[PDB]
Amino acid sequence: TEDGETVKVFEDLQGFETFIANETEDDDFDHLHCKLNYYPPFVLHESHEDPEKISDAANSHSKKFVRHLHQHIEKHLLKDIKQAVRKPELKFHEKSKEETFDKITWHYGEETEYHGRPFKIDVQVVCTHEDAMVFVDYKTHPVGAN
């Protein structure tokens, strides 16, 4: 896995989820930032399990691509994040979707607390018109610190 700036960029859910879980055990949960860039399972399954065989139509301009991506986000990705932060019943009370010609961005946000420390979880998920890759950004920070 790459460190793009001071942030780890993972290529699979296992590495990403394990990072978040370990950093939670290590009391670092309120100052985390990592990324995950991958192709969603459905698009690989549609393309002979080869990124080079993915249709050029499989991108943010395909209603089917977007719908199936959202389904994966809601069934798997968020479930993994909730498991890792030890809050399986968490709900994100901030949700948004922004669509431009070039990309669709979903945001899921929640102010929560763990070990007596309040913190904000922000999950950004981006898909684009250029190709089928999905870009996840996971970031936390304290709330109301002085």
Residue numbers in the entry: 16 to 161
Quote the authors verbatim.
Like the majority of uncharacterized genes from S. cerevisiae, YER067W codes for a short protein (≤20 kDa) that is present in duplicate in the yeast genome (shares 70% identity with the ORF YIL057C), and its homologs are restricted to fungi and contain no characterized functional domains. Transcriptional control of YER067W by the main stress-responsive gene activators of Saccharomyces cerevisiae explains the wide range of conditions in which expression of this gene is induced. Altogether, these results show that both the Yer067w and Yil057c proteins are involved in the control of energetic metabolism and significantly contribute to cell fitness, especially under respiratory growth conditions. Additionally, the functional evidence points to an involvement of Yer067w in the oxidative activity of yeast that is coupled to ergosterol metabolism.
Therefore, we designed a shorter construct of Yer067w, named 11V-161NYer067w, by removing ten N-terminal residues (1MTKKDKKEVK10). High-quality crystals of 11V-161NYer067w were obtained allowing the determination of structure to 1.7 Å resolution using the multi-wavelength anomalous dispersion (MAD) method. The structure reveals an α/β topology with a seven-stranded mixed β-sheet backed by four α-helices on one side. The secondary structure elements are arranged in the β1-β2-α1-β3-α2-α3-α4-β4-β5-β6-β7 order. The longest helix, α4, transversally crosses the β-sheet and is mainly stabilized by hydrophobic interactions involving the nonpolar amino acids F80, L84, I88, L92, I96, and V100 that are facing the inner face of the β-sheet. Analysis of crystal packing reveals that Yer067w forms a dimer in the crystal. The strands β4 of each monomer align into an antiparallel β-sheet to yield a continuous fourteen-strand β-sheet in the Yer067w dimer. The most prominent patch of invariant surface residues is located in a cavity at the junction of all four helices. However, the conserved cavity is long and has a largely hydrophobic character, hinting at the large size of the ligand and suggesting that this cavity is likely to be a protein-binding site. Thus, the Yer067w structure likely defines a new subfamily of the α/β proteins, contributing to our understanding of the protein-fold space and the relationship between sequence and three-dimensional structure.
